[PDB]
Design an enzyme around this catalytic site. Structure first.
Site, short mmCIF file in Angstrom:
data_model
loop_
_atom_site.label_atom_id
_atom_site.label_comp_id
_atom_site.label_asym_id
_atom_site.label_seq_id
_atom_site.Cartn_x
_atom_site.Cartn_y
_atom_site.Cartn_z
N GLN B 11 0.82 -1.20 0.00
CA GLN B 11 0.00 0.00 0.00
C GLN B 11 0.86 1.26 0.00
OE1 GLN B 11 -2.79 2.25 3.26
NE2 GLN B 11 -3.52 0.26 2.51
N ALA B 12 1.89 1.29 0.84
CA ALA B 12 2.75 2.47 0.90
C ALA B 12 3.45 2.69 -0.44
CB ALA B 12 3.76 2.34 2.03
N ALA B 99 -0.80 -9.71 3.49
CA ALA B 99 0.10 -10.37 4.43
C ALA B 99 -0.27 -10.10 5.89
CB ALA B 99 1.55 -9.94 4.17
N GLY B 143 4.58 -2.82 6.70
CA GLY B 143 3.59 -3.71 6.13
C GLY B 143 4.14 -5.10 5.91
N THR B 145 3.46 -6.93 3.25
CA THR B 145 3.90 -6.97 1.86
C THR B 145 5.13 -6.09 1.65
OG1 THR B 145 1.65 -7.41 1.09
CG2 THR B 145 3.23 -6.56 -0.53
N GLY B 146 5.08 -4.86 2.15
CA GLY B 146 6.20 -3.95 1.95
C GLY B 146 7.50 -4.48 2.53
N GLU B 183 5.26 -3.68 13.57
CA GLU B 183 6.11 -3.11 12.53
C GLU B 183 7.60 -3.10 12.89
OE1 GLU B 183 2.55 -0.18 10.87
OE2 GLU B 183 4.64 0.33 10.49
N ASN B 228 1.90 11.85 1.04
CA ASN B 228 2.48 11.30 -0.17
C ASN B 228 2.86 12.39 -1.17
OD1 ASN B 228 2.28 8.72 0.86
ND2 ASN B 228 0.36 8.24 -0.21
N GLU B 254 25.92 6.10 -10.04
CA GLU B 254 26.53 7.31 -9.49
C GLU B 254 25.99 7.63 -8.10
OE1 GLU B 254 26.71 10.26 -12.47
OE2 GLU B 254 27.90 11.69 -11.28
N1 LIG Z 1 3.87 7.70 3.94
C1 LIG Z 1 2.96 6.74 3.75
N2 LIG Z 1 2.94 5.66 4.59
C2 LIG Z 1 2.03 4.67 4.42
C3 LIG Z 1 1.10 4.74 3.40
N3 LIG Z 1 0.33 3.63 3.48
C4 LIG Z 1 0.76 2.87 4.52
N4 LIG Z 1 1.81 3.52 5.12
C5 LIG Z 1 2.60 3.06 6.27
O1 LIG Z 1 3.00 1.73 6.01
C6 LIG Z 1 2.90 0.94 7.19
C7 LIG Z 1 1.89 -0.18 6.95
O2 LIG Z 1 2.30 -0.99 5.87
P1 LIG Z 1 1.47 -1.09 4.49
O3 LIG Z 1 2.28 -0.61 3.31
O4 LIG Z 1 0.17 -0.34 4.60
O5 LIG Z 1 1.15 -2.66 4.39
P2 LIG Z 1 1.40 -3.52 3.06
O6 LIG Z 1 2.76 -3.22 2.44
O7 LIG Z 1 0.29 -3.27 2.07
O8 LIG Z 1 1.39 -5.06 3.53
P3 LIG Z 1 0.05 -5.81 4.07
O9 LIG Z 1 0.26 -6.16 5.52
O10 LIG Z 1 -0.14 -7.07 3.26
O11 LIG Z 1 -1.15 -4.90 3.90
C8 LIG Z 1 2.45 1.87 8.29
O12 LIG Z 1 3.59 2.37 8.95
C9 LIG Z 1 1.79 3.01 7.55
O13 LIG Z 1 1.88 4.20 8.30
C10 LIG Z 1 1.11 5.83 2.54
O14 LIG Z 1 0.29 5.91 1.63
N5 LIG Z 1 2.04 6.83 2.72
MG LIG Z 2 -1.73 -3.83 2.28
#
Ligand SMILES: Nc1nc2c(ncn2[C@@H]2O[C@H](COP(=O)(O)OP(=O)(O)OP(=O)(O)O)[C@@H](O)[C@H]2O)c(=O)[nH]1
Ligand SMILES: [Mg+2]
Ligand SMILES: Nc1ncnc2c1ncn2[C@@H]1O[C@H](COP(=O)(O)OP(=O)(O)CP(=O)(O)O)[C@@H](O)[C@H]1O
Ligand SMILES: Nc1nc2c(ncn2[C@@H]2O[C@H](COP(=O)(O)OP(=O)(O)O)[C@@H](O)[C@H]2O)c(=O)[nH]1
Ligand SMILES: COc1cccc(C(=O)Nc2ccccc2F)c1
Ligand SMILES: COc1cccc(C(=O)Nc2ccccc2F)c1
Ligand SMILES: [Ca+2]
Ligand SMILES: [Ca+2]
Ligand SMILES: [Ca+2]
Ligand SMILES: [Mg+2]
Ligand SMILES: [Mg+2]
Lengths: 425, 438, 54, 349
Positions: B11-12, B99, B143, B145-146, B183, B228, B254
């Site tokens: 999502q991020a 995830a 996250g 996934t992230g 996290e 964002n 670089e």
């Molecule tokens: N700056 C910013 N941070 C985000 C955003 N969306 C989520 N986050 C941050 O990301 C973290 C949560 O991870 P996510 O990216 O939402 O989860 P994911 O990567 O989709 O993985 P899943 O658990 O499968 O949903 C938290 O710290 C949130 O504050 C965004 O759009 N902008």
């Molecule tokens: Mg997600």
């Protein structure tokens, strides 16, 4: 499309479940016939979480009604929103369970369980991506307690990687039907310890005291109690039924609320709780104070007697999210002695713009507190006062059970109590 | 010309990616339908912007981007958003269940079943490149996934593209905009497995972005859209050298040469100025000296920390707008005599300066005000190690009780991976302390 | 305070100022890790089913 | 309700500040590892400044300035004075000092000897004192350097004040302790009460072997001196008596003859490092209590000896000073529901 399958079993389970579908149907704009008549797209955004969509834009609850006697479900089918349920989803016997856990779990319940699983399998096969299940029941009776936990065990065997949550009503001598309720509750609690991911502990003692003392109801009835349960169930499920910056399914919420697999029994809470001064606006500070007040808790446990492992607070209505964070951060930073310091940032806040019917704003409290041990101690002690004399055991041995199974359920719950105690220190 | 492929994970990553490509199009004059009038070479070309955009016969400029998420709700925004026409379906990959904030679920359980599909889609973009430089990977630390899928993807990319650089834009977890308590676990697990696969990583702490939005943009409760848009301005300032004519940071290699003398210490601190509220009546335009001086105030760093108490290893100044070298040098002299800027003895005490004459682009209706000149400083400070220490401490508090560990073991991860990842982080903190010791 | 490597183009310029002189796992191995975790999930699930069968 | 933690059980100063905070009924003490605090009474060494100011909604404050050790270390102070243009190598109120590393480990050995040989040839007094963060006083450079090599830590060799001001009767040495409080706004407050730590032994310039008349430390006098507590209780003369002495003996006052120089030195040292340690634009706030130690020579010129980052207080002055810390340092950031005891040393920030 994160579908949830709802199961309601027994008298208590079906009467609370009926009111739950009545309340959320109103919030989503679904009338008693399943037709939509709302004025906001937020109502239909996440409608498929709890409702199936049939021909003619009809919405049918994804609910399965289970009982070992017909009376309660006859009342549902004739109640307010009775016609909204799928006729094929009523599964019931005629024998009854006689407030007997063994009858629900081993004899009468065993004859009916396969037909219930057929309906469950039917609802699941039509889900794009099933999140998991939710069960409403009591632990003091026979069907919801005995057959309810039997159903959980066979649902876990067939869907082992799906979330299983329950709203479980705990018995109390103050609002009791029979003396065997501690027996039935102790037997169920061990089933829940093993096979549920989240269990909301709803204590009839707390529901009674809230009606008698806070709501000033002279003679509370089961209906009055179920009003509190309806409102609470609507608050805990709000975030899944409406959109918002919170994108959480049942598994995500479980991952952030349950630090240890067996310690998944929650204290729910709701605010406001006003007696009929009912038109007065309720400020955010008042919502926060009451929401954390023991007198608003529904587990009949004093939070100041233990420690919070995790807390989730859900605010509903149009309000200052800045003032929400300020008051939340105020309650934590003013009573950090009741929050375990080895889980950083263990108090999470979630907001929803659509308030419940007839309220400008409200707050729902979900606490995973070690204080819940007082509930299991109370049950444990009532169990032992009878079991030490083998009183009323013949109702259970007559269904094939042995005394050893009671001794093991006794020890299993004292182990659970001991587990909460170690994390409280 | 050499191509760069952007990968957005979770999502991020996806929501930040959507904000960047919106900004990219506004900077290059690309319309939402993909057309670009100023591009006089229809259906091709090896211009600077072509590093990020391919071209179809019909004249559409298509981002060299893949979006990956294990649930579809976030990427569905891109499919029906303003810039839906930019991408084709092969660029948007979505699963059906995420995830659940569980590193083990994204890396092992779900990652194993989707990794090959994600590589195939990336390979299709790679086959369009005559000289692929490498990848830019956007993701959160917190996250499932992230954290979990990204680390797996980075491991595979090092296998399938051994000679390609990989840069990261990573979102560091901040409780003010997070509802997850695990996290710290995910952040440390993904840092451990990604450390040797990333040549340069720009961490952005949501706490810092959150406070800049409240302090400078007067947003009482910033949203992900506010956060964002500010982040995409910083990201744009970092990747501009790859997208416009120039001579500084002209290719991904670089970035490592200029910012990372030691491979493991590859986390440069980003500082950006000025951030002015659009709702203001009208702001006095800051000078080169003032915006340059602002690069040494902790209040506009992407990660809150105190560079006065670390050592510098590298320092780049990236200017956009009305800026001439004369004023940059005069400002640099003023700041040395006033600030506490200590370089390591085995690195020169100097600054690499890049100037792009086109001032920052602001999204119409956005929160940022149009300014005549802006700067983003990229400095590799040991002071950013404060961020690891904070994260490792929260890790230690929960892991001492094995709180939440069963969720990870339940998805097939071994408990020893926690301690293995934690010990690697301890060695990382020790590496920073060895470089910045007096 | 010396300036070096001044490059100028129509869209900008770049230079360097010196204030003071100085003083992987193979594809095979990644599959084993993924399959090992999968095997651990399978074993844990089999123990659950065995428990439910009893 | 404000919250604070205590992470230094040995601080007599902040043990009283903690006692006062709780007495107000408006401060609550948390466990030392609880991160949800407003105020941290941190530990002396390795205080985790990196974890401060990251709690949502909590304004956080700590009783130590990160980086102030540059001023409160023997070798650090010498390096700062010689390298900072504000103080310059020609600083007139700091004794000629040199940083000497033992040979078993930049170093200023040769530079010291060059200055040492110059004094020896010019018939001038050539007595130096060696000390580190265990003191030796000698007029031979061979003894000083050899004494440091026998140790394994950095030392400083500075000029020994051979013409100290001697109190009468007794003919005895002394030093002046000044307590200074710098708040979060970097205001420099000087506690109106100082203490002279006097030597109860006659000063003897023909014998630096017996260090009881040369070291005015309260611990050395109460352990190796045979006249401890003779002229003043606990070898502690306070400003009222000293000011009365300076009038009767030298026909001058403590403010004119000494305090003006002390206030000047304090400002110079603290203003010098302000850009390095100021928390004005930081995510957390700092304050700190310093103990400045001065020497007075027979010409009534004040010399800075050292700066203490975690000083103790004279028993008689704990109540007043500690209360003053709560007023200007703590309550100024966390207000509660005179005639100040401090002297504000105005300056440009
Ligand atoms: N700056 C910013 N941070 C985000 C955003 N969306 C989520 N986050 C941050 O990301 C973290 C949560 O991870 P996510 O990216 O939402 O989860 P994911 O990567 O989709 O993985 P899943 O658990 O499968 O949903 C938290 O710290 C949130 O504050 C965004 O759009 N902008
Ligand atoms: Mg997600
Ligand atoms: N250059 C010098 N000339 C004369 N006397 C000196 C001197 N340096 C130190 N002294 C004497 O030594 C005593 C203490 O020395 P110093 O302050 O270096 O040790 P210390 O730091 O352990 C004591 P404190 O920290 O409490 O002030 C002082 O009382 C002073 O009289
Ligand atoms: N809160 C609430 N509790 C109930 C209700 N009906 C029964 N109970 C409680 O449930 C227990 C009896 O179980 P019951 O559901 O009637 O038995 P079952 O039909 O075999 O499942 C006792 O503890 C009752 O106090 C109800 O409508 N609301
Ligand atoms: C001596 O007092 C006793 C002894 C044994 C049991 C109980 C008791 O509380 N029973 C009970 C509790 C909840 C619901 C139904 C119940 F019957 C009290
Ligand atoms: C059957 O049990 C259920 C059903 C639906 C939702 C939840 C739940 O846990 N929701 C939640 C928890 C914390 C914060 C916000 C939330 F929305 C539980
Ligand atoms: Ca039968
Ligand atoms: Ca072209
Ligand atoms: Ca590589
Ligand atoms: Mg009944
Ligand atoms: Mg000292």
């Amino acid at each position: 499309m994160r579908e949830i399958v709802h199961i309601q079993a027994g008298q208590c389970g079906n009467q609370i479940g009926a009111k739950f579908w009545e309340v959320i149907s109103d919030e989503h704009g679904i009338d008693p016939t399943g037709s939509y008549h709302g004025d906001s797209d937020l109502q239909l955004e996440r409608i498929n979480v709890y409702y199936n969509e049939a021909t003619g834009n009809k919405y049918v609850p994804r609910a399965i009604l289970v009982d070992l006697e017909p009376g309660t479900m006859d009342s549902v089918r004739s109640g307010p929103f009775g016609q909204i349920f799928r006729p094929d989803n009523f599964v019931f016997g005629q024998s009854g369970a006689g407030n007997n856990w063994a009858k629900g779990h081993y004899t009468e319940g065993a004859e009916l369980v396969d037909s219930v699983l057929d309906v469950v399998r039917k609802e699941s096969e039509s889900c794009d991506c099933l999140q998991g299940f939710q069960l409403t029941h009591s632990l003091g009776g026979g069907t919801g307690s005995g057959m309810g936990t039997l159903l959980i065990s066979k649902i876990r065997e067939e869907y082992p990687d799906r979330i299983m949550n329950t709203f479980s009503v705990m018995p109390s001598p103050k609002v009791s039907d029979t003396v065997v309720e501690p027996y039935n509750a102790t037997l169920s609690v061990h089933q829940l310890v093993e096979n549920t991911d989240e269990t909301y502990c709803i204590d009839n003692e707390a529901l009674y005291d809230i009606c008698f003392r806070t709501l000033k109801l002279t003679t509370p009835t089961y209906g009055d109690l179920n009003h509190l349960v309806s409102a609470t169930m609507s608050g805990v499920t709000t975030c899944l039924r409406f959109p918002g910056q919170l994108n959480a399914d049942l598994r995500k919420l479980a991952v952030n609320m349950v630090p240890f697999p067996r310690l998944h029994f929650f204290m729910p809470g709701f605010a406001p709780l006003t007696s009929r001064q009912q038109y007065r606006a309720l400020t955010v500070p008042e919502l926060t104070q009451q929401m954390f007040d023991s007198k608003n808790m529904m587990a009949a446990c004093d939070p100041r007697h233990g420690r919070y492992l995790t807390v989730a607070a859900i605010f509903r209505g149009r309000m200052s999210m800045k003032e929400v964070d300020e008051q939340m951060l105020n309650v934590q930073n003013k009573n950090s002695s009741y929050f375990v310091e080895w889980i950083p940032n263990n108090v999470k806040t979630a907001v929803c713009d659509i308030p419940p019917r007839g309220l400008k704003m409200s707050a729902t409290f979900i606490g995973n507190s070690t204080a819940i041990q007082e509930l299991f101690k109370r049950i444990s002690e009532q169990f032992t006062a009878m079991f030490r004399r083998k009183a009323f055991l013949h109702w259970y041995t007559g269904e094939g059970m042995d005394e050893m199974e009671f001794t093991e359920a006794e020890s299993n719950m004292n182990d659970l109590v001991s587990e909460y105690q170690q994390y409280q220190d | 010309m050499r191509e760069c492929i952007s990968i957005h994970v979770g999502q991020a990553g996806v929501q930040i990616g959507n904000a960047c490509w919106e900004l990219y199009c506004l900077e290059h004059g690309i319309q939402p339908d993909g057309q670009m009038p100023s591009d006089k070479t229809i259906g091709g070309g090896d211009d600077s912007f072509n590093t990020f955009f391919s071209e179809t016969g019909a004249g559409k400029h298509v981002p060299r981007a893949v979006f990956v998420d294990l649930e579809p709700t976030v990427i569905d925004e891109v499919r029906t958003g303003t810039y839906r026409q930019l991408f084709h379906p092969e660029q948007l990959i979505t699963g059906k269940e995420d995830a659940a904030n569980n590193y083990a679920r994204g890396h092992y359980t779900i990652g194993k079943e989707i990794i090959d599909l994600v590589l195939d889609r990336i390979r299709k973009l790679a086959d369009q490149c005559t000289g692929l430089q490498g990848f830019l990977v956007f993701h959160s630390f917190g996250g499932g996934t992230g954290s979990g899928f990204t680390s797996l993807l980075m491991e595979r990319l090092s296998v399938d593209y051994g000679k390609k650089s990989k840069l990261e834009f990573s979102i560091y977890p901040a409780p003010q905009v997070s509802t997850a308590v695990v996290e710290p676990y995910n952040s440390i697990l993904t840092t451990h497995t990604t450390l040797e696969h990333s040549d340069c990583a720009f961490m952005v702490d949501n706490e810092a972005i959150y406070d800049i939005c409240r302090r400078n943009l007067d947003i009482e409760r910033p949203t992900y859209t506010n956060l964002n848009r500010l982040i995409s301005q910083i990201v744009s300032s970092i990747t501009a050298s790859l997208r416009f004519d120039g001579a500084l940071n002209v290719d991904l290699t670089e970035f490592q040469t200029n910012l990372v003398p030691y491979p493991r210490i590859h986390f440069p601190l980003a500082t950006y100025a000025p951030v002015i509220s659009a709702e203001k009546a009208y702001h006095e335009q800051l000078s080169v000296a003032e915006i340059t001086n602002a690069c040494f105030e902790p209040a506009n760093q992407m990660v809150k920390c105190d560079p006065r108490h670390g050592k510098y290893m590298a320092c780049c100044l990236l200017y956009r707008g009305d800026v001439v070298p004369k004023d940059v040098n005069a400002a640099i002299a003023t700041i040395k005599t006033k600030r506490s800027i200590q370089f390591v003895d085995w690195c020169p005490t100097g600054f690499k300066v890049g100037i792009n004459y086109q001032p920052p682009t602001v999204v119409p209706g956005g929160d940022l005000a149009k300014v005549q000149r802006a700067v983003c400083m990229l400095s590799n400070t040991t002071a950013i190690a404060e961020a690891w220490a904070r994260l490792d401490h929260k890790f230690d508090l929960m892991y001492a009780k094995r709180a939440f560990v069963h969720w990870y073991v339940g998805e097939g991860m071994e408990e020893g991976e926690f301690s293995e990842a934690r010990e690697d982080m301890a060695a990382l903190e020790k590496d920073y302390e060895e470089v910045g010791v007096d | 305070m010396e300036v070096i490597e001044l490059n100028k183009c129509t869209s900008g310029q770049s230079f360097e100022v010196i204030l003071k002189p100085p003083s992987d796992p193979s594809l095979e191995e990644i599959q084993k890790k993924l399959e090992a975790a999968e095997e651990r999930r399978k074993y844990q699930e089999a123990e659950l089913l065995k428990h439910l069968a009893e | 309700m404000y919250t604070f933690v205590v992470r230094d059980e040995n601080s007599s100063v902040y043990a009283e500040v903690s006692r006062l905070l709780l007495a107000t009924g408006q401060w609550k003490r948390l466990r030392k590892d609880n991160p949800r605090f407003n105020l941290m009474l941190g530990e002396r060494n390795r205080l985790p400044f990196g974890r401060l100011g990251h709690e949502p909604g909590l304004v956080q404050l700590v009783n130590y300035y990160r980086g102030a050790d540059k001023l409160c270390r023997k070798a650090s102070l010498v390096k700062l004075i010689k390298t900072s243009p504000e103080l310059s190598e020609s600083c007139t109120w700091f004794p000629e000092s040199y940083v000497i590393y033992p040979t078993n480990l930049t170093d200023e050995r040769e530079v010291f000897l060059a200055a040492y040989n110059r004094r020896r040839e010019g018939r001038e007094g050539n007595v130096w004192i060696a000390k580190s963060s265990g003191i030796l006083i000698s007029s031979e450079a061979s003894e000083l350097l050899d004494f440091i090599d026998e140790q394994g830590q950095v030392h400083v060799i500075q000029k020994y004040l051979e013409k100290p001001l001697l109190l009468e009767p007794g003919h005895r040495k002394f030093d002046i302790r000044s307590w200074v409080l710098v708040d979060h706004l970097y205001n420099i407050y000087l506690y109106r009460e100082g203490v002279l730590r006097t030597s109860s032994e006659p000063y003897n310039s023909a014998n630096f072997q017996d260090k009881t008349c040369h070291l005015t430390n309260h611990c050395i006098q109460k352990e190796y001196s045979k006249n401890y507590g003779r002229y003043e209780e606990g070898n502690e003369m306070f400003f009222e008596e000293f000011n009365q002495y300076l009038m009767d003996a030298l026909n001058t006052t403590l403010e004119n003859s000494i305090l003006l120089q002390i206030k000047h030195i304090i400002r110079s040292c603290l203003m010098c490092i302000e850009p390095a340690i100021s928390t004005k634009h930081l995510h957390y706030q700092s304050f700190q209590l310093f103990g400045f130690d001065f020497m007075v020579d027979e010409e009534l010129k004040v010399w800075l000896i050292e700066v203490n980052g975690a000083p103790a207080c004279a028993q008689k002055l704990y109540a007043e000073l500690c209360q003053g810390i709560v007023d200007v340092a703590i309550s100024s950031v966390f207000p509660l529901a005179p005639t100040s005891i401090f002297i504000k040393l105005h300056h440009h920030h």
